[PDB]
Design an enzyme around this catalytic site. Sequence first.
Site, PDB file in Angstrom:
ATOM      1  CB  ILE B  47       3.622   8.761   1.112  1.00 11.55           C
ATOM      2  CG1 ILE B  47       3.467   8.347  -0.529  1.00 11.55           C
ATOM      3  CG2 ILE B  47       2.906   9.834   1.491  1.00 11.55           C
ATOM      4  CD1 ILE B  47       2.061   7.538  -0.717  1.00 11.55           C
ATOM      5  CE  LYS B  74      14.745   8.514   5.108  1.00 11.68           C
ATOM      6  NZ  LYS B  74      16.037   8.578   4.038  1.00 11.68           N
ATOM      7  CG  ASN B 119       2.232   8.417   5.354  1.00  8.87           C
ATOM      8  OD1 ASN B 119       2.038   7.297   4.981  1.00  8.87           O
ATOM      9  ND2 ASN B 119       3.047   9.345   5.101  1.00  8.87           N
ATOM     10  CB  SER B 173      -5.225   2.946  -0.094  1.00  6.56           C
ATOM     11  OG  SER B 173      -4.949   2.668  -1.515  1.00  6.56           O
ATOM     12  CE1 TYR B 188      -2.504  -1.519   2.352  1.00  5.78           C
ATOM     13  CE2 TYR B 188      -3.830  -0.909   0.545  1.00  5.78           C
ATOM     14  CZ  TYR B 188      -2.838  -0.819   1.298  1.00  5.78           C
ATOM     15  OH  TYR B 188      -2.067   0.571   1.175  1.00  5.78           O
ATOM     16  CE  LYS B 192      -3.951   1.733   4.441  1.00  3.05           C
ATOM     17  NZ  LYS B 192      -3.624   2.850   5.552  1.00  3.05           N
ATOM     18  CB  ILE B 220       2.130   6.876  -4.852  1.00  2.00           C
ATOM     19  CG1 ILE B 220       0.867   7.616  -4.713  1.00  2.00           C
ATOM     20  CG2 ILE B 220       3.365   7.948  -4.794  1.00  2.00           C
ATOM     21  CD1 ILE B 220       0.412   8.708  -5.742  1.00  2.00           C
ATOM     22  CB  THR B 222       6.246   4.862  -2.553  1.00  2.00           C
ATOM     23  OG1 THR B 222       4.961   4.047  -2.809  1.00  2.00           O
ATOM     24  CG2 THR B 222       6.002   6.368  -2.296  1.00  2.00           C
TER      25      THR B 222
HETATM   26  N1  LIG Z   1       1.378   3.351  -3.658  1.00  2.00           N
HETATM   27  C1  LIG Z   1       1.503   3.333  -2.609  1.00  2.00           C
HETATM   28  O1  LIG Z   1       2.287   2.831  -1.917  1.00  2.00           O
HETATM   29  C2  LIG Z   1       0.237   3.665  -1.759  1.00  2.00           C
HETATM   30  C3  LIG Z   1      -0.915   3.750  -2.128  1.00  2.00           C
HETATM   31  C4  LIG Z   1      -2.142   4.246  -1.314  1.00  2.00           C
HETATM   32  C5  LIG Z   1      -1.841   4.502   0.004  1.00  2.00           C
HETATM   33  N2  LIG Z   1      -0.447   4.388   0.545  1.00  2.00           N
HETATM   34  C6  LIG Z   1      -0.280   4.384   1.950  1.00  2.00           C
HETATM   35  O2  LIG Z   1       0.714   5.173   2.159  1.00  2.00           O
HETATM   36  C7  LIG Z   1       1.476   4.660   3.572  1.00  2.00           C
HETATM   37  C8  LIG Z   1       2.834   4.795   3.331  1.00  2.00           C
HETATM   38  O3  LIG Z   1       3.290   3.929   2.478  1.00  2.00           O
HETATM   39  P1  LIG Z   1       4.779   4.285   1.940  1.00  2.00           P
HETATM   40  O4  LIG Z   1       4.239   4.632   0.328  1.00  2.00           O
HETATM   41  O5  LIG Z   1       5.287   5.226   2.625  1.00  2.00           O
HETATM   42  O6  LIG Z   1       5.419   2.811   1.779  1.00  2.00           O
HETATM   43  P2  LIG Z   1       6.887   2.323   2.586  1.00  2.00           P
HETATM   44  O7  LIG Z   1       7.880   3.116   1.752  1.00  2.00           O
HETATM   45  O8  LIG Z   1       6.717   0.948   2.579  1.00  2.00           O
HETATM   46  O9  LIG Z   1       6.742   3.016   4.032  1.00  2.00           O
HETATM   47  C9  LIG Z   1       5.907   2.723   4.969  1.00  2.00           C
HETATM   48  C10 LIG Z   1       6.225   3.228   6.074  1.00  2.00           C
HETATM   49  O10 LIG Z   1       5.491   2.731   7.083  1.00  2.00           O
HETATM   50  C11 LIG Z   1       6.271   2.637   8.186  1.00  2.00           C
HETATM   51  N3  LIG Z   1       5.812   1.159   9.014  1.00  2.00           N
HETATM   52  C12 LIG Z   1       5.387   0.292   8.277  1.00  2.00           C
HETATM   53  N4  LIG Z   1       4.896  -0.694   9.349  1.00  2.00           N
HETATM   54  C13 LIG Z   1       5.130  -0.212  10.352  1.00  2.00           C
HETATM   55  C14 LIG Z   1       5.014  -0.627  11.807  1.00  2.00           C
HETATM   56  N5  LIG Z   1       4.502  -1.818  12.115  1.00  2.00           N
HETATM   57  N6  LIG Z   1       5.141   0.064  12.769  1.00  2.00           N
HETATM   58  C15 LIG Z   1       5.804   1.454  12.411  1.00  2.00           C
HETATM   59  N7  LIG Z   1       5.915   1.997  11.372  1.00  2.00           N
HETATM   60  C16 LIG Z   1       5.680   1.118  10.305  1.00  2.00           C
HETATM   61  C17 LIG Z   1       7.643   2.264   7.529  1.00  2.00           C
HETATM   62  O11 LIG Z   1       8.657   2.495   8.607  1.00  2.00           O
HETATM   63  P3  LIG Z   1       9.927   1.514   8.273  1.00  2.00           P
HETATM   64  O12 LIG Z   1      10.249   1.396   6.685  1.00  2.00           O
HETATM   65  O13 LIG Z   1      11.063   2.453   8.906  1.00  2.00           O
HETATM   66  O14 LIG Z   1       9.421   0.217   8.894  1.00  2.00           O
HETATM   67  C18 LIG Z   1       7.534   3.509   6.824  1.00  2.00           C
HETATM   68  O15 LIG Z   1       7.966   4.844   7.378  1.00  2.00           O
HETATM   69  C19 LIG Z   1       0.916   3.439   3.997  1.00  2.00           C
HETATM   70  O16 LIG Z   1      -0.289   3.331   4.773  1.00  2.00           O
HETATM   71  C20 LIG Z   1       0.057   2.927   2.484  1.00  2.00           C
HETATM   72  O17 LIG Z   1      -1.012   1.935   2.944  1.00  2.00           O
HETATM   73  C21 LIG Z   1       0.546   4.218  -0.408  1.00  2.00           C
HETATM   74  C1  LIG Z   2       1.216  -4.926  -5.693  1.00  2.68           C
HETATM   75  C2  LIG Z   2       0.807  -4.595  -4.280  1.00  2.68           C
HETATM   76  O1  LIG Z   2       0.777  -3.142  -3.911  1.00  2.68           O
HETATM   77  C3  LIG Z   2      -0.102  -2.632  -3.541  1.00  2.68           C
HETATM   78  O2  LIG Z   2      -0.546  -3.007  -2.333  1.00  2.68           O
HETATM   79  C4  LIG Z   2      -0.623  -1.278  -4.405  1.00  2.68           C
HETATM   80  C5  LIG Z   2      -1.211  -0.255  -3.165  1.00  2.68           C
HETATM   81  O3  LIG Z   2      -1.086  -0.266  -2.126  1.00  2.68           O
HETATM   82  C6  LIG Z   2      -2.506   0.435  -3.995  1.00  2.68           C
HETATM   83 CL1  LIG Z   2      -3.389   1.290  -2.614  1.00  2.68          CL
END
Ligand SMILES: NC(=O)c1ccc[n+]([C@@H]2O[C@H](COP(=O)([O-])OP(=O)(O)OC[C@H]3O[C@@H](n4cnc5c(N)ncnc54)[C@H](OP(=O)(O)O)[C@@H]3O)[C@@H](O)[C@H]2O)c1
Ligand SMILES: CCOC(=O)CC(=O)CCl
Lengths: 280, 280, 280, 280
Positions: B47, B74, B119, B173, B188, B192, B220, B222
């Site tokens: 994201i 990037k 984020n 989230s 989690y 959030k 999402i 991702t």
């Molecule tokens: N469907 C979903 O995934 C979903 C749902 C709702 C909300 N969200 C929220 O959206 C946010 C982004 O998730 P995403 O989809 O981008 O997942 P992702 O592909 O795992 O990316 C997570 C991002 O957070 C960074 N990060 C993780 N741990 C970190 C740490 N300890 N220090 C600094 N940076 C850190 C990662 O950097 P690196 O990879 O470079 O380490 C990456 O840029 C999260 O807060 C998640 O809770 C997403």
């Molecule tokens: C299977 C675990 O994946 C998750 O945590 C999904 C989310 O973040 C939804 Cl907010």
Amino acid sequence: SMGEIESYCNKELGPLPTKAPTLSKNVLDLFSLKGKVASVTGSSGGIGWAVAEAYAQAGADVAIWYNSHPADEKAEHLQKTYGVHSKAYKCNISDPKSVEETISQQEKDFGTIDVFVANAGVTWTQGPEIDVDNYDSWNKIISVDLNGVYYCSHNIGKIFKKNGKGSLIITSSISGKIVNIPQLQAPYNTAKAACTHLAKSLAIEWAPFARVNTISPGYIDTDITDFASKDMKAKWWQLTPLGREGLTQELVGGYLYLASNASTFTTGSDVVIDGGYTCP
Amino acid sequence: SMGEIESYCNKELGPLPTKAPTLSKNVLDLFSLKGKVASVTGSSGGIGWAVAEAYAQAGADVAIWYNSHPADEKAEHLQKTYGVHSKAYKCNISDPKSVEETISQQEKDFGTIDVFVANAGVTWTQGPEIDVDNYDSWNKIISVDLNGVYYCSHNIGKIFKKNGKGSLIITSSISGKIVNIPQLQAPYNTAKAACTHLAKSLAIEWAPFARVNTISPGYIDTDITDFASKDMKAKWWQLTPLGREGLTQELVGGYLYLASNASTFTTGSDVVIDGGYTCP
Amino acid sequence: SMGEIESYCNKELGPLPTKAPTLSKNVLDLFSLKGKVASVTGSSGGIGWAVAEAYAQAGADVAIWYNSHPADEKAEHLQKTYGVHSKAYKCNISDPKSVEETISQQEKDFGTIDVFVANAGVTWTQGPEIDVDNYDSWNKIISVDLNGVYYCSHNIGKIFKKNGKGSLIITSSISGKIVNIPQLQAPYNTAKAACTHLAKSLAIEWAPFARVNTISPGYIDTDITDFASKDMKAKWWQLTPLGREGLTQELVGGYLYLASNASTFTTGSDVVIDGGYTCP
Amino acid sequence: SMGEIESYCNKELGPLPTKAPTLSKNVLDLFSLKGKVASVTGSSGGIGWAVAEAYAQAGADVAIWYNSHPADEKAEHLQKTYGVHSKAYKCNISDPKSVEETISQQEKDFGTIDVFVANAGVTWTQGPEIDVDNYDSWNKIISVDLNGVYYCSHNIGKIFKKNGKGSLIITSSISGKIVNIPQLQAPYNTAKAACTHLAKSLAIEWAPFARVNTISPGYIDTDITDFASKDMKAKWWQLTPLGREGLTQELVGGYLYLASNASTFTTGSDVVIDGGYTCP
Ligand SMILES: NC(=O)c1ccc[n+]([C@@H]2O[C@H](COP(=O)([O-])OP(=O)(O)OC[C@H]3O[C@@H](n4cnc5c(N)ncnc54)[C@H](OP(=O)(O)O)[C@@H]3O)[C@@H](O)[C@H]2O)c1
Ligand SMILES: CCOC(=O)CC(=O)CCl
Ligand SMILES: NC(=O)c1ccc[n+]([C@@H]2O[C@H](COP(=O)([O-])OP(=O)(O)OC[C@H]3O[C@@H](n4cnc5c(N)ncnc54)[C@H](OP(=O)(O)O)[C@@H]3O)[C@@H](O)[C@H]2O)c1
Ligand SMILES: NC(=O)c1ccc[n+]([C@@H]2O[C@H](COP(=O)([O-])OP(=O)(O)OC[C@H]3O[C@@H](n4cnc5c(N)ncnc54)[C@H](OP(=O)(O)O)[C@@H]3O)[C@@H](O)[C@H]2O)c1
Ligand SMILES: NC(=O)c1ccc[n+]([C@@H]2O[C@H](COP(=O)([O-])OP(=O)(O)OC[C@H]3O[C@@H](n4cnc5c(N)ncnc54)[C@H](OP(=O)(O)O)[C@@H]3O)[C@@H](O)[C@H]2O)c1
Ligand SMILES: CCOC(=O)CC(=O)CCl
Ligand SMILES: CCOC(=O)CC(=O)CCl
Ligand SMILES: CCOC(=O)CC(=O)CCl
């Protein structure tokens, strides 16, 4: 296997539907806590002491908690005015190991715990958060208000699982649903919303055995709110439909309702005793 | 003194009513971020990268963030496809001092920061919390998801106050409003829900200069959710009105709307891009 | 004049703070309804009959209501098993004039009304609303579920104002917070959210004298839900943390808690007895 | 049959997961409404006219609506300043048959309707509801604010289903989440919560083809709020974190975001453009 239904929330519930509990016929006999142990955290304060007394009045072996204000005359006062076994424990809610020691020492002196009330916390009285340059006051709020509630809940849940019954009552605040207007306390609001949503989250996981609820109060008249300037306290009355500050005796009804068998179907709810503050 | 009105929420707003901002006449010209710096935290993920590209497409000097997945191609890809100054920074969001160093190094290479997107976070993939006996996975979630957002917000706010303008976008989230049905992730959801209310709390204090909002998404598609078993992922589609998993391109619209001048009156809100999951 | 505070919500509260009520010392004596009249609307059904019996068990002069299922053996059964004055009234809740006649005929046979429970309504069992081409089923739901609650509340309030005390309990549903997943009933959900927010709205206006609350239940096992196909009823258990359907005896505790003096500070709240359905 | 997944919310979605829509690559090209017809209800007022102009600025064939303030120079002004086909229709939103005639007459002069905005209503300016003894002002609010929205959204849905695409935007108010402090308008708050929950309810049923959302605003500076006494309007600024009244140009961004392809995953949500009023 085949023909039975399996829950989507918690697969450990078993073949649905789960059998309903056996409840008394008289409504007034549902609220009785006879033959139940009710460990109330932070029972040496304003709201904790009232809840402990109310649980003792309902015939419950209440366990008192304190950190820095010794409360042993409070525990003795409940063991001679109502004839219910009680004791006082000194625990630092912010210490992960102390909580485990203090809860295992309560399952031994009472046999079991049937009601828990995570009702300990501190308030943020430093004004806007953008003025403090040290992450020490924020770290304290997240350690006593949020982390402490998890330490208490993670250990008490283990006792409920073996027994198969229980009731957890986290004491969040209206700060978990609104933002206090006159005072600016972001760290406090953040921690209370965390507790309010943790109570709901644990309800899905504790559904098989126990129940989790919240008693989010409003501006109760305890030792916590009796420091604010009358100018600040004047803006609280102006924004409360009931137009006053609630008393500690107006919360016991809500606390005894979510601990007894009356609320045998209320799981992961939020009873908001606020006087109507969250409505405006 | 006399005749002027003083706000009840934040007394620093000045003599009310505050003058309204000057906005363009064409709607499509409100969403443009020309001449603005947009630091997006965790911009090397699923994201974060989409939001960074969308902000760059709107003519913004985006700043990339990463922790363990180096993202310097990037940042270079955004400095040659759209002609917008960009850079990549390695910061540990869980380190209070590293965040300060990485943000002060961004106000120097760009002159100022006009848009921030906290984020970054990690997910709880250990099952029910009553099975883990070590407070090391819970402490990690509260350190990267909740404490990290405060470290990012407590430092970025100091830059908005001097400038008098800004926009913070915390990516919470749907776990801050519901409890994920199939999986059991209480730590989690608690983290959030904490951010979802911290954004609201900061909105009252940052009202004079900046704005704070939330972009709470749903399921999402991702790298975070591309590990769950198809049996688990099948219960997500069954409980989503739209009946699918959202794409990262379906979130940029909501992120660019709360960062540009289009949302010049949306303060402390919560845009829920969930596909209708929270309705059922 | 000068020196006194005037409320922002309701200016009729008087010079704030309003004096707090006098409450008993024993918690169990707060829930008693001795010497109180409790008119329960729709007291010839599943939830209304249980609430009427529970109020009678607490020593209250309950008034029974019915429309098409005559309930005069129910009223007599409460006048000989508990020794509390009771009577049965035939009123069409959807008729504005009939409600006035039936409430004025209750303030005369009992002297006064101290507790009201607007707990009458019908369900939408016609499937998706985009298939019905006549606005006669939608108009019926809005006439009994929503308009009827206003007719009952607008008349009962005139009695509370003269007495200066009272308690109104509107029985909304979880449909005022969520959307029932298996069945598609948009008109029913729309009407119940209206009642749920009307209860809150009347709380600010009735703050000076009375209190208004909601008892939004979940999937209680009454005559309303005992028609759905077992395939439909199987999806209700799968999405309920407690994994079952609540009984009518699991709701009296909440109804007696918001009618007695125990909830002397709960105004404009919403007690959700759902079994955790709204959590996921 | 076997191997496919059937949704729990709406069984008409088909074999899940539903294919995701095709979206542009540039973020700014997602907000464009080129080649789309956008019928905006009540487009001869304060918020309706701004939304109609904003949709026309994005290249949309907007349809003007009016009841008693003739707006034909407004429709002509949009057909010569932006070159987008437009027309003005006189409809009584409270008349079930007039709405059907006025919508079937819009699917004929434009070919189809791709965006609808139910944004017509009246406000309750009679003070507390316990002072009006005639159910005629209450019946009017429920006829234009709530029933009118159902009439508009019950005929437009029949057009979306045949086309398989669409976007409905109900204009509720913050009164569907809070209670206006200074003024006492219970009938208005009740109707707006009904619309807010009806938008969510229709989202589950319209998931297969269309989308439904809400744009609940705060205290916008339109002709509706430009009658309240400055004493009343002074209490609105004091309780608004932003400390002012929003303009009609601060809402177009939210309305164009939920009508275009940018919000291709936001279904049954609620964008609260309130200035932070609901946070306190
Ligand atoms: N469907 C979903 O995934 C979903 C749902 C709702 C909300 N969200 C929220 O959206 C946010 C982004 O998730 P995403 O989809 O981008 O997942 P992702 O592909 O795992 O990316 C997570 C991002 O957070 C960074 N990060 C993780 N741990 C970190 C740490 N300890 N220090 C600094 N940076 C850190 C990662 O950097 P690196 O990879 O470079 O380490 C990456 O840029 C999260 O807060 C998640 O809770 C997403
Ligand atoms: C299977 C675990 O994946 C998750 O945590 C999904 C989310 O973040 C939804 Cl907010
Ligand atoms: N109006 C209100 O005050 C209000 C509003 C809503 C919610 N609440 C919440 O209700 C709870 C009870 O507040 P109260 O009225 O009882 O306030 P209080 O008079 O300050 O009492 C707080 C209680 O928490 C205990 N405690 C505090 N810090 C602790 C720590 N680090 N370790 C262990 N125990 C600790 C105190 O023990 P010692 O005094 O013995 O140290 C005492 O028993 C708090 O969590 C508060 O946030 C109250
Ligand atoms: N699981 C559930 O059923 C559930 C869920 C949540 C909320 N609720 C709500 O709780 C309320 C009570 O339902 P219930 O469980 O008691 O089932 P019920 O027996 O069908 O309840 C309807 C009750 O209201 C009366 N009533 C119905 N239509 C009326 C009308 N037009 N005029 C006057 N009285 C009328 C009925 O009296 P007669 O039978 O004598 O006509 C009966 O006492 C309803 O408003 C329902 O929406 C129940
Ligand atoms: N600050 C605010 O005013 C505010 C707050 C939040 C939400 N809202 C809601 O936004 C909507 C728009 O209000 P506004 O700002 O546009 O003020 P307004 O000019 O008074 O809005 C009313 C609009 O609806 C039309 N209308 C009113 N009654 C009608 C009826 N019976 N039949 C058909 N059309 C009717 C009016 O057309 P004619 O003038 O031609 O009759 C006008 O276009 C309302 O539903 C209001 O409740 C506004
Ligand atoms: C003056 C500071 O007092 C408080 O923190 C008040 C509360 O706890 C309300 Cl939840
Ligand atoms: C099968 C139709 O039954 C219902 O309407 C269920 C409820 O009332 C839940 Cl609030
Ligand atoms: C003074 C009466 O004005 C209003 O009704 C204000 C609103 O609509 C706010 Cl939603």
